[PDB]
C-alpha cells in the first residue's frame, strides 16, 4: 500500500489531516481525519482560519439536498447546508465516489488557526451523524461504490518535539492507508479487542496500570459511560473518578520532583533545561483491553513521552517543554490523539475489532519502549460495559 505511505500531515494538538478533493473540476481540501465522530464536512465559506474552502457553485456535480445541519459538541460548533459530490483521496484508493458532503456555513471554535485543515472526515458509523443515522457516512460510501475492503488503519506521528508552522507543513504526520494494513508501520504483534456497537469506535478497558500497580477500581469505571478511540481528540480523556485517582498516582510516582497544579489541570506548560526532560520519573500507563478469545485480555502501554504534549516555550528559549495530555472527561474515556500516535491502530469495520501493534513512529528513550502485550486470563469482561 506505498501509495498511502505517509499521505498524512499534522501533530496531535491540531489534529492530522489527509488530502482530498471534492467537485467537477476537482477542489483541494485538507480533511481532519476524525474516527470520533461520522460527517464529511468542509469549510463552504470565507472564514479568518481558512486559506480555502469548497464553492459548490463551481461544481458541476454538486447535488443540494434542500436540508440544513447542525453539529454541536461541548468544546466548539458547526452549521451547514447538506449535499452531495464526488469525492477522492488522492494519496488513497485510486477510486472517486459520490457521498455527502456538510457544506459548512457558521462555526464556532471549530476551525483552529495555522491547523492547515478545511474540513473533516467523521470515520464513525452512522448512528452518531447528523441529522440523523440517514446520512450515509463517508466510509460506507466508499466501500458501497467500489471494491476496497471495509477496513482502514492509522499511525499517527507525533514528532516528540514542537513543530513549527514551516515544519508541520514539510513533515510526513503518519499513514493513512484505506482498504488495508501495512505492515512497515508496526513492530511486533497485532492485538484485537472487539467493537462492542458500532455507533463511535467502542471498546472495553477491563485494568489499568500505572507503573504495573493496579489503580484498582471497579472495572466499569473505565468506561463510564463510554470508551473510545479518537482520533479527532488530542488527549486521553478519562471520567472523573479515574481520571483523579490516575493524577494521584501519576503525581506519587512522579513525587521527586513537584509541579503547579495548573500542570496537572492541562492548562500550564512544564520546561525543562535542553535535553534534561526527566522521563524516567514519569510512570508508563497500561490500558488492559478485552480480548477477541473469551476470558482473555491484552495491554497497550504509553510511555511519558505519549501523555506528555511538546509546546514549543512560551519565550521560544532552548527549553524542552510540554503540556499534561491527561484531562477530566465528563462523558467516558476518550483515547485520543497522543495514545493513538504510540501504536499503529487499525479499524477492522469487516471483522468489527480494532488491532493494536507498537508503531514504528512512536517517540520513546534508550530505557523504556510503548508495548502491546498479552494474553492475559481476565473474567466477567463483558460487564464492565456500561448500559
Ligand atoms: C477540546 O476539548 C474536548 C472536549 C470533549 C470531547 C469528546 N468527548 S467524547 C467524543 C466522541 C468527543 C469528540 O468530539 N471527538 C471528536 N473528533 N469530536 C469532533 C471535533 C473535532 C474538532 Cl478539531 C473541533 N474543534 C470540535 Cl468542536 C469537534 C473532545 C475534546
Redesign the pocket.
Known sequence: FVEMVDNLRGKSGQ?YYVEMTVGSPPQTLNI?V????SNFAVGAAPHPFLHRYYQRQLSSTYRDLRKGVYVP??????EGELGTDLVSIPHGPNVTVRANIAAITESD????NGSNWEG?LGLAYAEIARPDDSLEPFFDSLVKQTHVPNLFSLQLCGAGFPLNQSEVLASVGGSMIIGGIDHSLYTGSLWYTPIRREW?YEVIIVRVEINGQDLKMDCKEYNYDKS?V??????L?LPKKVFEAAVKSIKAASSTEKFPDGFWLGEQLVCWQAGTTPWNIFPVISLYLMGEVTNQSFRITILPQQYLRPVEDVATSQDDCYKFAI?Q?S??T?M?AVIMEGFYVVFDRARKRIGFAVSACHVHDEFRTAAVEGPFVTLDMEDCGYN
Open positions: 489534529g481532519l476524525d474516527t470520533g465522530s459538541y461541548t468544546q466548539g460548533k458547526w471554535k471549530f476551525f483552529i473533516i463511535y473510545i479518537d482520533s479527532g481528540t488530542t488527549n480523556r484531562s472527561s462523558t467516558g476518550v485520543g
